[PDB]
Structure 1
Amino acid sequence: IDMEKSQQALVQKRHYLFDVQRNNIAMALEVTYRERLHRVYREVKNRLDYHISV
């Protein structure tokens, strides 16, 4: 009886895995977003630094 009850309780958290998956993938997309922003900023500043140094 109690083993079955334990399985029933374990069912409740049966979704957490996909919650984790979603969090990870979404935040990875956010990572790509943010790094793209920082990289474009970097490139523009570098390109203008070229001419400043000139």
Structure 2
Amino acid sequence: QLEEVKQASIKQIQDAIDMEKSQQALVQKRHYLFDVQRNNIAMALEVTYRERLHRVYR
């Protein structure tokens, strides 16, 4: 008797967990990614304004 009950109890929550983790992951990593892709571009930018002021002033 007891065997099959524990087999079901494992499988049901398992499925919850793994999907809820799969959802949560992709949301977070991309919304994070969204902003990382900024940050990359734009860093370049501030550098060149910084640099210009030195460069001309020299």
Q: TM-score interval w.r.t. the shorter chain?
A: 0.7 to 0.9
- State percent identity of aligned pairs: 6
Structure 2, unmatched stretches of 5+, are none
Which has the larger Rg? 2
How many residues align? The count is 54
Q: CA RMSD in A?
A: 1.6
Distance, in Å, in 2 between the alignment partners of 1:52 and 1:39 is 22
Structure 1, unmatched stretches of 5+, are none
Q: What per-residue deviation string (whole Å, max 9, x for no partner) do you get for residues 5-54 of structure 1?
A: 10221133122111111222222212211212322331221120121221
Runs (4+) of structure 1 exceeding 6 A deviation are none
| 1:8 correspondence with 2:8 | yes
TM-score, normalised relative to structure 2:
0.70
